[PDB]
From a paper:
[name] is an esterase that belongs to the α/β-hydrolase superfamily and primarily hydrolyzes cutin from plants. Unlike lipases, cutinases lack the active site-covering lid structure such that the substrate-binding cleft is exposed and directly accessible from bulk solution. In addition, the substrate-binding site is more expansive in cutinases compared to esterases, benefiting the binding of bulkier macromolecules. In this work, we investigate the PBAT hydrolysis potency of cutinases and PET-degrading enzymes, and find that cutinases outcompete other reported enzymes.
Author numbering: 40 to 301
Amino acid sequence: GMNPYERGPNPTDALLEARSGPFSVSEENVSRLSASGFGGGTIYYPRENNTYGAVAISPGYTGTEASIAWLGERIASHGFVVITIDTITTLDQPDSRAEQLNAALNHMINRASSTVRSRIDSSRLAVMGHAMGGGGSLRLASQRPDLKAAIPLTPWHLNKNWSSVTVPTLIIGADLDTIAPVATSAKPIYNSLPSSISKAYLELDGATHFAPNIPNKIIGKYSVAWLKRFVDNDTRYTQFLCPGPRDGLFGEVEEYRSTCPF
């Protein structure tokens, strides 16, 4: 098609809500010893002979790669090369996690096997992270306006003012989070982002701080729609983001805000 970055079948709610997307995925192990500037991890990549955008995902404080593994694989299965990382130590702070997200992106582009490197369009990169890892994704986005998307999940950073970020950013909050409360963290972060960038706020209903650490159909669906729209420029996914998920009785979320139209 006209957009050279479109991958996969035309989307539906059911296809985005499924446990796995349409792309067969393989894994490349990144040992802690092979990793420069992060703690190792796993690269999930589509076996099909396309090039895809690449995504690095960081866990949060005391969290391991296993706390975010499901989301990396799910996203990769919709047509992305995704690394889920361990950090250098489990106690690393958000700004350290930002440096490690950068190191993880660089590893995929420079240090992985030719099998992985040949499937990456190194010009189309995104970052994600849970909690302090979401704070890391915000810091790195602020330093790297070349990134195509950022998805901070139940994020925390010391700094809530990310008005300098121009990367399309989807903030995911959890209404029952007591560890990084949306009242003091996710919502101040989201409202700091400029009106003039592509951004959205998605607050999960009945959700704790740890909602991102188990398979979650809503997180999977809208993370994939966000990356599709902004890493792939794929306007087939605009309809999922704008006006976006409904709230209330038959809805998907507690609250959704956006700078739609995209």
